[PDB]
Design a protein around this ligand. Structure first.
Ligand SMILES: CC(C)(C#Cc1ccc(-c2ccc(Cl)c3c(NS(C)(=O)=O)nn(CC(F)(F)F)c23)c([C@H](Cc2cc(F)cc(F)c2)NC(=O)Cn2nc(C(F)(F)F)c3c2CCCC3)n1)S(C)(=O)=O
Ligand SMILES: CC(C)(C#Cc1ccc(-c2ccc(Cl)c3c(NS(C)(=O)=O)nn(CC(F)(F)F)c23)c([C@H](Cc2cc(F)cc(F)c2)NC(=O)Cn2nc(C(F)(F)F)c3c2CCCC3)n1)S(C)(=O)=O
Ligand SMILES: CC(C)(C#Cc1ccc(-c2ccc(Cl)c3c(NS(C)(=O)=O)nn(CC(F)(F)F)c23)c([C@H](Cc2cc(F)cc(F)c2)NC(=O)Cn2nc(C(F)(F)F)c3c2CCCC3)n1)S(C)(=O)=O
Ligand SMILES: CC(C)(C#Cc1ccc(-c2ccc(Cl)c3c(NS(C)(=O)=O)nn(CC(F)(F)F)c23)c([C@H](Cc2cc(F)cc(F)c2)NC(=O)Cn2nc(C(F)(F)F)c3c2CCCC3)n1)S(C)(=O)=O
Ligand SMILES: CC(C)(C#Cc1ccc(-c2ccc(Cl)c3c(NS(C)(=O)=O)nn(CC(F)(F)F)c23)c([C@H](Cc2cc(F)cc(F)c2)NC(=O)Cn2nc(C(F)(F)F)c3c2CCCC3)n1)S(C)(=O)=O
Ligand SMILES: CC(C)(C#Cc1ccc(-c2ccc(Cl)c3c(NS(C)(=O)=O)nn(CC(F)(F)F)c23)c([C@H](Cc2cc(F)cc(F)c2)NC(=O)Cn2nc(C(F)(F)F)c3c2CCCC3)n1)S(C)(=O)=O
Ligand SMILES: [Cl-]
Ligand SMILES: [Cl-]
Ligand SMILES: [Cl-]
Ligand SMILES: [Cl-]
Ligand SMILES: [Cl-]
Ligand SMILES: [Cl-]
Ligand SMILES: [Cl-]
Ligand SMILES: [Cl-]
Ligand SMILES: [Cl-]
Ligand SMILES: [Cl-]
Ligand SMILES: [Cl-]
Ligand SMILES: [Cl-]
Ligand SMILES: [Cl-]
Ligand SMILES: [Cl-]
Ligand SMILES: [Cl-]
Ligand SMILES: [Cl-]
Ligand SMILES: [Cl-]
Ligand SMILES: [Cl-]
Ligand SMILES: [Cl-]
Ligand SMILES: [Cl-]
Ligand SMILES: [Cl-]
Ligand SMILES: [Cl-]
Ligand SMILES: [Cl-]
Ligand SMILES: [Cl-]
Ligand SMILES: [Cl-]
Ligand SMILES: [Cl-]
Ligand SMILES: [Cl-]
Ligand SMILES: [Cl-]
Ligand SMILES: [Cl-]
Ligand SMILES: [Cl-]
Lengths: 219, 218, 219, 218, 218, 219
């Protein structure tokens, strides 16, 4: 990663063995459950493109998902090149060359160049741009590897309402979209798919009931 | 988090893999027992709103509780907005814009803006404000996920007094001061078994818990 | 905790996850054996009142003991207030308000105030004062949760003297008092409660025998 | 390794016990799976040739692979010597002698000489040059220890398409761009089972892997 | 402990949770085997008397041994007092009072006084003086808890010579130089079995242990 | 160990508990397999003679090997004294006394003296000299505790060539000597002791075949 030293300088630091192992283990244990995305974002805090590639490369298995990840990265790289065409010319002593999409992804850039972009004034955060592309691709994988659809989450006749809401929002979380779309699913399905006993109790509470109030009434 | 380096400067630091792992494991092992709140508060020491969102996001399962958490955060965010009406105008070179409720919660603010507020002079501690909202919401979850009421904790006829007081105060802690002193000293005696109850009335009012527990050991 | 940086300044540091976990685990594994007190004192090295409350709050179970701990803290807090009545008046720019008993215990003081007291010149060590109260209460719990009394430690007819002395001082350690009282128990009971074979051997050694000499003679 | 301290100076640091243990364990658990190469590259971040030799030396077993590694290193060392003919002469007070192939590999150079080259201005990065040779040799071992050829990866008649693509690209990664794109998009379809193959021809050319995998889920 | 920071200053540092845990575990697993002494000495590197008391206090069980340890410490403390008679008088602004035996042992001295002695110029190393007393007492415990005498270590008629020498020197280490050389070279041969003994007399005096072990492999 | 601080000064640092435990564990798990030597060298990076003695002393068991280690150290210490006779005379304010062999081994020198030698300008690296002697003795133990001789490594009639080469170089590695002697064993035995099918294939490849080429042809 790029961390701050004691002189106000942003300097490169080696990725720690604990960080490497933590990322490998979370993929091993959780596959592509939704909580793997925050794990990846935090473990790649301040990462260079090289560090991001290191983390993705150390993943064992799930190579179909990782290949989909590469395709998403290339799409974002192609879009970046269309939005930032490079301007030919000799690079000045101080400055650094403009980064292409393949430079952000770390395929055509060295670590020294990645450090130069990230520690520049103002910084060009190729690590955060690359991380955005990876997380975009990881969100697609979480979508695809989700076993259940939100329309199939129905409360059982003897299932506690808390367990039903657990399944509802677990399923809703794996279908990543805007909150306007997640609030729409809730207002469309959560009460309507509760079991008959709890459904009649919640409709009397009215639409203005909080989840806390809904869960309290169906205890 | 935002911590002091070895030379007195407030700088941003990445949340450590040990901190992330510790928080994930304690929720996995303890769910929403009362001791999860101090663990969260300590593990989020110096956290930015982004760190707090990271920690809450790494929680697997318990999405009903975590959704209740979002609603509590939105309630506190709305109250913050009502108490701090925004003043329109261009931001001066040095200062930073005043934060809204969604900025404290980290949904409409960048990490750099959060660092700017927290390292400002004087600091706007958006991380501690957000953490206050989260702990408020986590406390609601603990109280709701408490299975037993203090009125149902009664000492068995052959149950050691120590084990009964363990269960009593464990339950009282989950049933989240004016009433916690109310349960103590009078509900505790009333729900003791007849054998220990008779010993405790002889002690008279003003007995410490140590004196109460010593008198009912045998 | 409050640690020293590289400029001679005492600054606040976050309690580490390793420290939190270590304290939780030692309570889980050892309950209130006597060695939990040194574990707590070392793990709370340099702790603020907030850190001390964090450690006590993270304890799962043993809530009867922890409630006795609160009562001991309130007694010491009440005594501190009786010995240090606060003097009303506006606090000067540099100085800090005088700490009440509830401020030392962290119930009416902020972390910022605790840092101010502990890093003041001269420091008011509210963390060490609070720690004294907690350890006082923890010593009472170790006393109460000790299963055996020193008068019941008697050497068996075939029990090795070393195992008997192990039980003797293990029991004596859980009854915390002054060493004058622990030397009294030893001079009153250790030889007198050895089995007949070793007892007759030790009485011939005389009162001036060291424990090493006593254990060597009864091997 | 040679890392920057908290004040901008390039100083030598001892390889940590965690780094040593991590490298030993990953070889123990993963042998020469493709993901062992990124692990080695990251764990040897900033390494001197001595650190690289330490890491390779701590490997227990697999001495046939490790001997192949030595031969690859010697081949690259010989090429370095042919491209950098040595210039005889006394070394000036300030500078350092030019490194031979065996100096980069750490067999004829001391740790102090390696520090001198790596911290020179401009630096002679003997650690990264050596690491390049090692990873080149490790890549040869991975390819040789790959059990299956990409031509033998065919989807079973009842095998889920996801599992088939997992095996396909796992195998393709061990079979170490002009031909890796060649297997993709046409070998992948050709080795699918008749049921999914018929769906994939209807998608037409230009289908992404996401579109291919979505179409053969059921 | 009292360690140097990253800038040359001797400052107090809290004993780490890893150091505490390591010491507790080694006593739990190894009791008072001889290798417990080096572990204690290394784990107490730079320790104050308070740290040393902390480490000894965290030991669970073995209270007979730990009481023998206290008596040894008191013996050394009394000898220190006899060798350093106290000089009455008011302490000057700069200096520190001379330490008694109980001050070195940490029973009558505060942590701040211990820091003052250890960071003084010249330093009064109360931590290393105390540690010397503790290791002296720990050595007495190891010797007392050694089950076997060197005279009872004899090679079996079919026991490999290597295993016999392992047991011989393991026992000799617990039986805590003038006599340790005495057991070596002549007791070692005398307690070998007749088969290896006959080989070792043919080697003649002056044989190294390597030569002795090589000659009795088969 | 002796590490560099932030002022360019080489200062003493305590040996870490992780380093102590790692060395103890590797001896417990690997005994005296050849890879224990690199483990020891890396874990003793920058070690003082005191640290080296600490690591050797913490070894449980294998006391015959450790005694052979002491004898090797004394031989090297005696040779050092013969090559560096000490010159009597008062030590100047700045300088330090010349180290004897027993000073390098840490038996007659204090930690303060070891720090003085190692941080001197120019440094007298007693830690690296001692480490050389220990590794010399450790190499002798790996030799002696090797169960197999290189002449007994013969490929089985159905044994894969890769497994045979694994055994060959594992055995060759435990007999530590110069590479000229290890290249001699390879050119004398590796092809000659392959099974008849692979042996005839390799002899046709000729002596100029690499190991990669030899292993590919006998797959
Ligand atoms: C970098 C990473 C790790 C990230 C992130 C991130 C950023 C902001 C927020 C967030 C914070 C507070 C509030 Cl108040 C809202 C809100 N308020 S609102 C209009 O009412 O919805 N929106 N959002 C999310 C949106 F970005 F829009 F600002 C809020 C979050 C929250 C944090 C959180 C998690 C938690 F567990 C409980 C909380 F209290 C807060 N995380 C999510 O909300 C993810 N989530 N998704 C669903 C879904 F899909 F099931 F509905 C559910 C959840 C959480 C649990 C209930 C259901 N994270 S990242 C991603 O890049 O890797
Ligand atoms: C930030 C977090 C981590 C926090 C906190 C915090 C702050 C102050 C105190 C505290 C300290 C000392 C005393 Cl004297 C009182 C007291 N004195 S009083 C009139 O009698 O009430 N009050 N309180 C708490 C109140 F806020 F009120 F000021 C006291 C605490 C205490 C610390 C503690 C824990 C412990 F284990 C044993 C102790 F000795 C001290 N923690 C609690 O007391 C929690 N607790 N609750 C109940 C209940 F509800 F069952 F009674 C019980 C307990 C503990 C076990 C017995 C029963 N923590 S956090 C979480 O916000 O994230
Ligand atoms: C401080 C410690 C840890 C050390 C060391 C050290 C120093 C240099 C080298 C080294 C580096 C690169 C090349 Cl090119 C050669 C070479 N080139 S050459 C003429 O063709 O032979 N020689 N040597 C070794 C010699 F010192 F001479 F410079 C080379 C080494 C190598 C590192 C290595 C290990 C590995 F696993 C694979 C590699 F690619 C490189 N380690 C060894 O070679 C040990 N080894 N021994 C035998 C034997 F005995 F079976 F043949 C075998 C091996 C390695 C595996 C195959 C067989 N380490 S230490 C010791 O003090 O604790
Ligand atoms: C130093 C070490 C650790 C390294 C490295 C490294 C460098 C660059 C890239 C990389 C990044 C993004 C893209 Cl877009 C491309 C691309 N775009 S392209 C035209 O389609 O090929 N190429 N490459 C790699 C090439 F060098 F070519 F530039 C890309 C990588 C990627 C990182 C990665 C891994 C992942 F898991 C998922 C990702 F999204 C990105 N790693 C690989 O791709 C390895 N890999 N190989 C194959 C193969 F062979 F089976 F196809 C497959 C994979 C990954 C899983 C699918 C199949 N690492 S190292 C080791 O040297 O020590
Ligand atoms: C902060 C914490 C962790 C503390 C402490 C502390 C302070 C001083 C001493 C201490 C040091 C050396 C000597 Cl010479 C004496 C002595 N000399 S004397 C008159 O002859 O008795 N007194 N004391 C104790 C007294 F404070 F008075 F100065 C001595 C201690 C000792 C350390 C120790 C432990 C050990 F294991 C073996 C040792 F060699 C030394 N610890 C104890 O002694 C506790 N202990 N108690 C009993 C009892 F009850 F069974 F007798 C026994 C023991 C130890 C084992 C034998 C029996 N710790 S804390 C608490 O706040 O958490
Ligand atoms: C502070 C602590 C941790 C210590 C220490 C320490 C100091 C010096 C030495 C040492 C170093 C090298 C040599 Cl050459 C001699 C030697 N040369 S000589 C005439 O032959 O005796 N003497 N001694 C030790 C004596 F103090 F005497 F100067 C030597 C040691 C050695 C280190 C060591 C350990 C090892 F495992 C193998 C080695 F190569 C070197 N440790 C011992 O030797 C302990 N030991 N004891 C016996 C006994 F008793 F059974 F013979 C045996 C052993 C080791 C295994 C064989 C038998 N440690 S501490 C604890 O105080 O807390
Ligand atoms: Cl690490
Ligand atoms: Cl890269
Ligand atoms: Cl989830
Ligand atoms: Cl509920
Ligand atoms: Cl820092
Ligand atoms: Cl970490
Ligand atoms: Cl971790
Ligand atoms: Cl955020
Ligand atoms: Cl509880
Ligand atoms: Cl009780
Ligand atoms: Cl930590
Ligand atoms: Cl507090
Ligand atoms: Cl005990
Ligand atoms: Cl005994
Ligand atoms: Cl540093
Ligand atoms: Cl480490
Ligand atoms: Cl480790
Ligand atoms: Cl080397
Ligand atoms: Cl793979
Ligand atoms: Cl799929
Ligand atoms: Cl420091
Ligand atoms: Cl630690
Ligand atoms: Cl720990
Ligand atoms: Cl003390
Ligand atoms: Cl031993
Ligand atoms: Cl042998
Ligand atoms: Cl450590
Ligand atoms: Cl030493
Ligand atoms: Cl090997
Ligand atoms: Cl092969």
């Amino acid at each position: 990663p790029i961390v701050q030293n004691l002189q106000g300088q942003m300097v490169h630091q080696c990725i720690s063995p604990r960080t490497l192992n933590a990322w490998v283990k979370v993929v091993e244990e959780k596959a592509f459950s939704p909580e793997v995305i925050p794990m990846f974002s935090a473990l790649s805090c301040g990462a260079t493109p090289q560090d991001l590639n290191t983390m993705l490369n150390t993943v064992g298995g799930h190579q179909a998902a990782m290949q989909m990840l590469k395709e998403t990265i290339n799409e974002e790289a192609a879009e970046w090149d269309r939005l930032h065409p490079v301007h030919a010319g000799p690079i000045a002593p101080g400055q650094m060359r403009e980064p292409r999409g393949s430079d952000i992804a770390g395929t055509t850039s060295t670590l020294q160049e990645q450090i130069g972009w990230m520690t520049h004034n103002p910084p060009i955060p190729v690590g955060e741009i690359y991380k955005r592309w990876i997380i975009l691709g990881l969100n697609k994988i979480v979508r695809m590897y989700s076993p259940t659809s939100i329309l199939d989450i129905r409360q059982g006749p003897k299932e506690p309402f808390r367990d039903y809401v657990d399944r509802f929002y677990k399923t809703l979380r794996a279908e990543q979209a805007s909150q306007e779309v997640k609030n729409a699913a809730t207002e469309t399905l959560l009460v309507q798919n509760a079991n008959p006993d709890c459904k009649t109790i919640l409709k009397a509470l009215g639409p203005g009931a909080t989840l806390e109030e809904m869960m309290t009434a169906c205890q």
